[PDB]
Design a protein around this nucleic acid. Structure first.
Lengths: 120, 175, 114, 122
RNA sequence: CCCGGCGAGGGGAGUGAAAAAGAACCUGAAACCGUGUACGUACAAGCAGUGGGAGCACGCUUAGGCGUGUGACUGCGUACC
RNA sequence: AGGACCGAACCGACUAAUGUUGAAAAAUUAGCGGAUGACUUGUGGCUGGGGGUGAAAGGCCAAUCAAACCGGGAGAUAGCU
RNA sequence: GUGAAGAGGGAAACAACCCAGACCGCCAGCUAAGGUCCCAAAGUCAUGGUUAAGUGGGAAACGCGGAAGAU
RNA sequence: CACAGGUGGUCAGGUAGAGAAUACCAAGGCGCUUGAGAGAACUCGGGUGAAGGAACUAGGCAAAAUGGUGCC
RNA sequence: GCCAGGCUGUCUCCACCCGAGACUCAGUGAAAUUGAACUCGCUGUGAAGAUGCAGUGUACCCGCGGCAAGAUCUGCCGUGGGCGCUGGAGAACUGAGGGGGGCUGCUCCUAGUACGAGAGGACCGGAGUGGACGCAUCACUGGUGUUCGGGUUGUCAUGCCAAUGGCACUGCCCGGUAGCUAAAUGCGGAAGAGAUAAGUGCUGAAAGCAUCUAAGCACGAAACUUGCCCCGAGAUGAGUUCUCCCUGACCCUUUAAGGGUCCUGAAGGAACGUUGAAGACGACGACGUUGAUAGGCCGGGUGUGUAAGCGCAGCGAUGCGUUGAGCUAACCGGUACUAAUGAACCGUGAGGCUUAACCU
């Protein structure tokens, strides 16, 4: 047990975690910046980077697959049009995380996560 | 007689000509050069210190760098000792290959078992305590194939330690 | 790593044909009798294929005397001599563990006709 | 492999159909018996007339195992079910001259030289 | 007036004999909780004290071996009703 | 038409577990039983304490009943701690 | 006779076993029971005898034996 | 006690449904007052599993298999 | 009321996976008990099993998780913080001592051999092969693998068809990546050595015989210990070996294991990040731009199975070539594309007294 296993627990229902990650990815795409806890931020990056990598290639099947794990037509439309060409040269590492201290509400560590370009 | 320190890589099956499948665990055996020699007159017993691997100069402590410089060899990833069998001695910097095991046919493997968390009374003795990360030896194992030019050793059965762990292979005392 | 991959691949013979699951196949097996060795022919249907490098093994099932006997043949073991496909089938299922209960017409499969 | 109180298929013309295990021999404090081991089984159904009568208790040996056995080359022989043939402490030669289904090659034991001849289908 | 959050609370100034009288307001003790000061303790076994007791700091007759703060070690010591 | 059957709501604690601190001074989860009959409940009134009530277990009558709470006889009484 | 209602010393510990009846203080000397290898204060003291088994340092009846005692 | 408990009656949609039971949705109300962490042994509620369905237990007590229409 | 049968981890043996507690981080937080505690084992005694009395032995101080033999305390396993081994620091080991088990069946040759009138019949314990225990492992046998893929009933939603996503135990099933797993496979109960009971013995009287012993003086049971592995210098008796670092100045006093000030900050560690087949929290391992430590990317591999769209056929279900295609978490070889920045803190500045041998 605990040997060579991926995926932090984030104690919750599996479908609940999947919906949580869908919402996280949608928010990050919409606003290009999130202010969230590091334990969740790591898996948010791991789950969102595949979406942007897939969006870099334009095709009906790719768009349908992106919408399947996104469930937001506007967000999917935002993909394949701005993020894809913006990061076309770069291969991987589309997100950066900067620590901003510990959350005052419950001392929970929190950090900003944003795209490499983030503007322009 | 004298054992060598190697690195576990994995284990698979080896097919014989007659059509028999034999489990084999794979040990990479780098040339374990000797750094220091212990003697009865000075150290109180006969032994030779073996080192293997490579450590980055930045991540090597200055005392260890000086010790290896005195030994006149590059710094390895660790130091180990082996009691001599009252045979011919060795010299500092004398690289030792796997050829010693090419004509033994019986070796023993010592290593650290894979770590595990707290274990219950049933899980331990069928009280609770730490599991794994403890020295353990399995004896009376016969070498299958030896590849000196590839630093590859195949030994029957299973040996303590998962992939990437360091182990010691010594001539089988029991026979 | 590289060493284990090299060790596994150096003992690979490019002679086994690519047979789909559920495809009737014959296998030649060396068997030791007395002080000699001889050939044995085993006809059956491949149920599952687990091609883990040189550990590749496939399960072949046969009906003898009214009972079903299934044996796992190693793809690259010296014991296995050659693999020949006689009757070609086509099932859209990697594993055929379901047919253990079927018999007669139900257990039969249709021709691929590819 | 066979455990205590397990049904074994009948592979002989003795007329037996269902046989139940009662005791396991072949090693002190043994929990399982292999294909090449002697086991103690009884009879649940018997033919109206014959040499086998209901309730008799006698030795037997498993010819086929559901779990199966391994081979030196890594091959495994697996059968659809467990099959056993009754054996007697005296006159080991079983009454049945015909055996259902194939048999494996581990029956080369000293006392099993007379059974390899039967079972023509391997 | 300032810190503080345009709070609570605190620090200055003033009044006030006195704020060591601030609305929790005469006098303010122990159980309980903290800082600093001086000493003992991480090789040392039991009603945790009693005599001996070197050592560790202060002031004294400016030594003359005095008292206060602690007690390493040591003989003895099996609570109250 | 059912002391009729399965099965909601509803009712009973018949059984198992949660606790005798407690969420509850008799409650919670689950199972089980009735679920047109011998049923239940919304609202109001009556049966008062050697009395009422009771298919009799001498059961119940506001923390209990087998003599309830209140104030008094009584700061009671014999032995004993 | 002791405890009850009397301390203290010895018997390794111990209330009924031996010496012995505490007015208080003193860094003084002499004794009773018990000791004088040490632990711990005193003779490794003297003379005449037993002991070879640690019996001393646990044991009866009986022909040194009997003899087997408590993590 | 903002407690987990009891509190009398009425309003009673759509889909697949014999059904006011069953599962998702309409309008409406809510995420229930500690959150986040690698996710150990162990406890509680569950799922799968090779040789078996009663060989543990005084005990088929939990769980598990089927859950109908017309005919031969 | 009883019988026959199918039917599940109730069990041999349990293995794995999903949730709430169990452990840490920020805050709230009460109880039963409480004479005081600097709360050890054994032996003897005791109003009679003594943590407290006499004798003896062990134990550095203080914390965290359970096993409950008596969850406050005594006690056990594992693991931590402080402290000393005498200038400091990083590694490697000797080892006083400590954990445990030393089981057992069948067959083969020996061998139908010695011995034995015949009948009868081994020592052998040499080889192979089982049973039970422990350790090791997932390539093989499979189980698990709700994070991967596919089939499928109902319902809602994406403006509608197609195609997709949520809910209904993972909605119900069929397979399965990596990890873990026994039912799977590798090894061990050594050989040899010391002392040995009984027993087997060279010469041998006292007591011209005899005798294991009086003199010279030899083997030996599966019984015991080493030999087999593991922890171990907190072994305070604090060990042995290697290497590295510091080579400044000044003032005062109660003038010495004295104090103070400026400068210096060495090796190493801790601090924080990526994190791991290390882990409850600690601790441990690899790396921190002089890089493959984590993520993503490329290609491969495994798994699942012929994705959507396109055009043809059936006026419809649906099939056909595209297509052994699409997707693929934890596996493998590369890739700095992203995250591990320059730094700050502790840790010092030649190491106390005495003795004996050396060049002075």
């Amino acid at each position: 047990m605990r040997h060579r296993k991926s995926g932090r627990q984030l104690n919750r229902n599996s479908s609940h975690r999947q919906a949580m990650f869908r919402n996280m990815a949608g928010s990050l795409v919409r606003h290009e910046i999130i202010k969230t806890t590091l334990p969740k931020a790591k898996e948010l990056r791991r789950v969102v980077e595949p979406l942007i990598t897939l969006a870099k290639t334009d095709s009906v099947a790719n768009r349908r697959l992106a919408f399947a794990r996104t469930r937001d037509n506007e967000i999917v439309a935002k993909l394949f049009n701005e993020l894809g060409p913006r990061f076309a040269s770069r291969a991987g590492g589309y997100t950066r995380i900067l620590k901003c201290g510990f959350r005052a509400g419950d001392n929970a560590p929190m950090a900003y996560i944003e795209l490499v370009d983030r503007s322009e | 007689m004298i054992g060598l320190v190697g690195k576990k890589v994995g284990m698979t099956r080896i097919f014989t000509e007659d059509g028999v499948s034999i489990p084999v665990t794979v040990i990479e055996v780098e040339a374990n050069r000797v750094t220091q020699v212990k003697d009865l007159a000075n150290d109180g017993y006969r032994a030779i210190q073996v080192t293997t691997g490579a450590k980055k100069a930045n991540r090597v402590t200055k005392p260890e760098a000086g010790h290896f410089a005195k030994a006149g060899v590059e710094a390895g990833r660790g130091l180990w000792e082996f009691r001599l069998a009252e045979g011919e001695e060795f010299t500092v910097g004398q690289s030792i290959s796997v050829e010693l095991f090419a004509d033994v046919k019986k070796v023993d493997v010592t290593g650290t078992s894979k770590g595990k968390g707290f274990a219950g009374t049933v899980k331990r003795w069928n009280m609770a305590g730490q599991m794994g990360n403890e020295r353990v030896t399995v004896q009376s194992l016969d070498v299958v194939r030896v590849d000196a030019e590839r630093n590859l050793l195949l030994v029957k059965g299973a040996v303590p330690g998962a992939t990437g762990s360091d182990l010691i292979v010594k001539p089988a005392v029991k026979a | 790593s590289n060493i284990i991959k090299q060790l596994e691949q150096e003992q690979m013979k490019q002679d086994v044909p690519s047979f789909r699951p559920g495809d009737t196949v014959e296998v030649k097996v060396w068997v030791v009798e007395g002080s000699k060795k001889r050939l044995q022919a085993f006809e059956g249907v491949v149920i599952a294929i687990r091609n883990r490098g040189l550990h590749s093994a496939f399960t072949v099932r046969k009906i003898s005397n009214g009972e079903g006997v299934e044996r796992v043949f190693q793809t690259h073991s010296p014991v296995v001599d050659s693999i020949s496909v006689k009757r070609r089938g086509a099932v859209r299922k990697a594993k055929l563990y379901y047919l253990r209960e079927r018999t007669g017409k139900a257990a039969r499969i249709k021709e691929r006709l590819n | 492999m066979i455990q205590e109180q397990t049904m074994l298929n009948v592979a002989d013309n003795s007329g037996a159909r269902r046989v139940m295990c009662i005791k396991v021999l072949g090693g002190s404090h043994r929990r399982y018996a292999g294909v090449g081991d002697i086991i103690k089984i009884t009879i649940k159904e018997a033919i109206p007339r014959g040499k086998v009568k209901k309730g008799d208790v006698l030795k037997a040996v498993v010819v086929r195992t559901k779990k199966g056995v391994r081979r030196p080359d890594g091959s495994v022989i697996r059968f659809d079910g467990n099959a056993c043939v009754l054996l007697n402490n005296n006159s080991e030669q079983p009454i049945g001259t015909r055996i259902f289904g194939p048999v494996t090659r581990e029956l080369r034991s000293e006392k099993f030289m007379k059974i390899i001849s039967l079972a023509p289908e391997v």
